[PDB]
Design a binder for these strands. Structure first.
Lengths: 259, 257
DNA sequence: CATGCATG
DNA sequence: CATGCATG
């Protein structure tokens, strides 16, 4: 149709119009520690006022959304101000290595990008590719697990005088990809059943919907967006590839052939 | 009916846990322009009272509804009672805090004027009350300092104060902020169900339908919507699809009492 | 920045 | 054994 019509018919489905997501059907996650792990408090590396100002907006947006909350924890990991090469564009990166080492690994069951796409039958050649924005943040952390990802932050304006931590699955945590992948799979099982004429590929927060015609792809995408929104997820409108015979997915490019 | 608790896990507190209004962003509480922090010292309480209350504080702590803090503000924590031998419940005297917070217009219905506008045509009702309603709304970090109170406890690792991360009890504007929050959230539901009459008084709801079937279809949709929005109803108190129910202290069968 | 590992 | 760099 247009892209704008897609934005208009599904405001709750896109991160750009429906605010940040939160998976309503997902119970708070408990992060099991290794049998012998004990809290570790890695001190915050000194940070220049310039770098701090540079990442302040990132922290603020999260605080305003309740994604970051104040806490007092025996755990602590460094907050790193990563500045884009040749610019004054900063972004925060939390070094969670010491926490990851004390958390038990979860054998990732995420499918191989290649096989996933290699299964698509030649009968379904119309595609819609979406990627959920701030995916991990849509999954809540049980309060007993929140203390694990604490970091230092100071700002009188926000009434923060010590530490903050995440209420959602953090970026940088080793099991986030698989935990999210499994969550979205559970949440989309119903959709798959309601649409036997459609193929749905999903790799963590990346989705590819395949149909036999532009019409079926159109109607399937409407259903998918409505389902994702109701479920509490948010797709990136700016990056979406709706109803095309040629799309980019998981690094792979599929036109009527592959990459 | 046992299908209600099995079919709608997210809508009931028992199966869905502490709620959290997903459409409602953490709340900022505006202080009056003249206001200044108030520090009221904690009145010492019997070691027997600090026991019957200890569990509450602990439970909130563990759910993250309470958090340690250092704040310029401080209000009393009162050891209330009950007929029982050891039934002490927390009561925070937020009066000095309320006097310093900017007032907001009362938008809550008048109790009775709510039922007065109830068509005789709708005689099938469902009464639901939301559990821990105010707690579904979060407090922005910037406004959390306002509600702090003293609890030095070695056992849990508290060196001084604790404060709320959710809309607290005793805060003058809690009833109004929740009522307005729930009203906005259930608006789409009202529009999509014109043949249904929905009354809302803070955390007390009453759904009215023309027939038993309509009530059941309506109730299923309401619970589904509440769950998705993050609210939680008390399945234990719920009166589902029946012509005689009690709502807002009003007994209403086929003739209001 | 800190640094874990595949890599020669 | 030494080290480039992807990733926290």
């Amino acid at each position: 149709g247009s892209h704008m019509t897609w934005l208009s018919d599904f405001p709750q489905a896109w991160a750009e119009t429906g605010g940040m997501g939160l998976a309503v059907r997902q119970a708070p996650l408990i992060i099991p520690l290794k049998a012998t792990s004990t809290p570790v408090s890695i001190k915050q590396y000194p940070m220049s006022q310039e770098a701090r100002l540079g990442i302040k907006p990132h922290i603020q947006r999260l605080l305003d959304q309740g994604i970051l909350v104040p806490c007092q924890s025996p755990w602590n990991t460094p907050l790193l101000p990563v500045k884009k090469p040749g610019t004054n564009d900063y972004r925060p990166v939390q070094d969670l290595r010491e926490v990851n080492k004390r958390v038990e690994d979860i054998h990732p069951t995420v499918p191989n990008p290649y096989n996933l796409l290699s299964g698509l039958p030649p009968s379904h050649q119309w595609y819609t590719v979406l990627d959920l924005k701030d995916a991990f943040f849509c999954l809540r952390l049980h309060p007993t697990s929140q203390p694990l990802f604490a970091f230092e932050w100071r700002d009188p304006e926000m009434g923060i005088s010590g530490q903050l931590t995440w209420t959602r699955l953090p970026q940088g945590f080793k099991n986030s990809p698989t935990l999210f992948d499994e969550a979205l799979h559970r949440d989309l099982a119903d959709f798959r059943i309601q649409h036997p004429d459609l193929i749905l590929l999903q790799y963590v927060d990346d989705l590819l919907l395949a149909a036999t015609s532009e019409l079926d792809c159109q109607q399937g995408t409407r259903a998918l967006l409505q389902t994702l929104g109701n479920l509490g997820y948010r797709a990136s409108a700016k990056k979406a590839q709706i109803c095309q015979k040629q799309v980019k997915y998981l690094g792979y490019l599929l036109k009527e052939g592959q990459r």
